[PDB]
Amino acid sequence: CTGCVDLDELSFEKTVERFPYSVVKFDIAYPYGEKHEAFTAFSKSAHKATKDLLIATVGVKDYGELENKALGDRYKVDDKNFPSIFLFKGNADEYVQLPSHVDVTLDNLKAFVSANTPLYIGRDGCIKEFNEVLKNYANIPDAEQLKLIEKLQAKQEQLTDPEQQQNARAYLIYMRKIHEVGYDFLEEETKRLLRLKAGKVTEAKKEELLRKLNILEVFRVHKVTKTA
Prior knowledge:
It is found in: Endoplasmic reticulum lumen. Its main location: endoplasmic reticulum. InterPro entries: ERp29, ERp29_C, ERp29_C_sf, ERp29_N, Thioredoxin-like_sf. Residues 1-4 are annotated as: CXXC motif. The chain is of the alpha/beta class. The protein has 2 domains: 1-122, Glutaredoxin, CATH 3.40.30.10; 123-228, Up-down Bundle (Endoplasmic reticulum protein erp29), CATH 1.20.1150. It contains 9 helices and 5 strands, in the order E-H-E-H-E-H-E-E-H-H-H-H-H-H. It has a 5-stranded mixed sheet. Strand 2, helix 2 (34-49) and strand 3 (53-59) form a beta-alpha-beta unit. Helix 2 crosses helix 4 (106-116) and helix 7 (162-181) crosses helix 9 (203-218). The chain is elongated, with a radius of gyration of 21 Å.
């Protein structure tokens, strides 16, 4: 899969022991089907979020000389219950296995990581470095919102990643609209977005409305503090 590093007997221990955290799927050789695709979707989203995570696969598939059987055997897994998901904390030795009763899904995969690490794979659309400075945005003074608008605008102009650049535009538009009209903007843009989402939409268009609603969610406050 994309971003997934496939490992073997020679490279596995050495590669896992070079990243602070590793998520490995053991499965047949040449994997396919829905669980492998959920792992593929996990691998892409995990890269979007993190510097520090190895996403990796090991093929076992026992029909020949037996590639990687000894590696599956180290971690006690079996053609009989593939896929098996392991999370390692920096060496081949400190690992947690995803419970077999747990469906291998994007959602469970992300939960598996933050459950067991200081890593956080964020919501599709979020930019951690924008989120880090925008708590309570709607409630802070005109003058600080204006300087946050200026600080994030300069950050936006230095982003090198295409999806980050697009997601930043939506942060800045929300920032500016909230500064201009106040907390009532949240409800207006939620109603706008949710009306489109409740339409007949493609998978790809849904995802992109979800990116905006997750960005928008950043700006919700628990209480309204600032004079409207």
